[PDB]
């Protein structure tokens, strides 16, 4: 079950990925301007990611426990 290993390694990776996330203020400086958030599609905001990762853990473990893994013809195909 390599899923445990990948979860552990991403959890250990999280600390330094947020460390390098906060390394530069230019990324934080461009935050809050919708002119780029609408262009990229959603937003530029990663501050509650700790809760996201600590919440996905139980969800993924539960998933593992449960093991979840023309117009004529179109109109005539419905009336039948």
């Amino acid at each position: 079950d390599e899923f445990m290993m990948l979860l552990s390694k991403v959890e250990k990776l999280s600390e330094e990925i947020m460390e390098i996330m906060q390394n530069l203020s230019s990324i934080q400086a461009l935050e809050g301007s919708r002119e780029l958030e609408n262009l990229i599609g959603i937003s530029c905001a990663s501050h509650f990611l700790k809760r996201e990762m600590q919440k996905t853990k139980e969800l993924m473990t539960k998933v593992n426990k449960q093991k979840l893994f023309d117009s004529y013809e179109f109109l005539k195909a419905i009336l039948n």
């Binding site: 958030e37 609408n38 599609g41 959603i42 937003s43 419905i78 009336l79």
Partner: protein, 224 residues
């Protein structure tokens, strides 16, 4: 009791036909009536949930019917709709716009057009995903806006197609296509013809010349 069962079956068939023709499947509907008479004023609150084939919604509004001797004015005093929390920010922007404009029919029609364009985008991306699996790299998935083309010989050279769906202030829905190239400067120093800066405009002219999928497959073949 066979006649009653026959009428129920006929009504169910008609309801299914209307739902699959219009494209809207509604959930349960609730109605409340309040009489505020001073010339008569009635406040009617309606609530209903539903879905369009891909997306669910839950709406609740109230209208004020003013019955007079010669006129019967109906105005949507308040409306409030809720979506599911998807990643489409423009969807929320349009929801806010419709909320502050207090209109209903344009919302339904725009939602229909939006899901229509979304389904064409998804079906087009997924077809090209399987047609040339050795030259396509769908990084985000068929339900996204990005498309990533890359050659397995060299991972350094790859580009992206951005397909966006936009809703104007009036309420219409229109798509847009563009490409972004992640090319190293080694190509710039190799070729002095300088045929990479004009890629966007030329590509948009190309897609307006012989179609969308034709231009995409031509690009795939040229990159092959």
């Amino acid at each position: 009791s066979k006649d009653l069962k026959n009428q129920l079956g006929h009504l169910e068939s008609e309801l299914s036909f209307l739902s699959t023709l219009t494209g809207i499947n509604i959930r349960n509907h609730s109605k409340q009536t309040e009489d505020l008479t001073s010339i008569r004023k009635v406040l009617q609150r309606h609530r209903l949930s539903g879905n369009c084939h891909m997306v669910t919604f839950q709406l609740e509004f109230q209208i004020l019917e003013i019955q007079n001797k010669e006129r019967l004015s109906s105005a949507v005093t308040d409306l409030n709709i809720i979506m599911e929390p998807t990643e489409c920010s423009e969807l929320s922007e349009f929801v806010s716009r419709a909320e502050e404009r207090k209109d209903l029919f344009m919302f339904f029609r725009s939602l229909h057009f939006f899901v229509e364009w979304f389904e064409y985008r998804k079906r087009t991306f997924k077809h090209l995903k399987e047609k040339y699996p050795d030259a396509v790299y769908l990084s985000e998935g068929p339900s996204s806006c990005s498309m990533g083309i890359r050659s397995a010989s060299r991972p350094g050279f790859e580009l992206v197609i951005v397909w966006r769906i936009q809703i104007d202030e009036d309420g219409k829905v229109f798509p847009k296509l563009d490409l972004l190239t992640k090319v190293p400067q080694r190509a710039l120093e190799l070729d002095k013809n300088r045929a990479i800066e004009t890629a966007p405009l030329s590509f948009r002219t190309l897609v307006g010349l012989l179609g969308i999928e034709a231009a995409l497959e031509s690009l795939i073949k040229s990159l092959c």
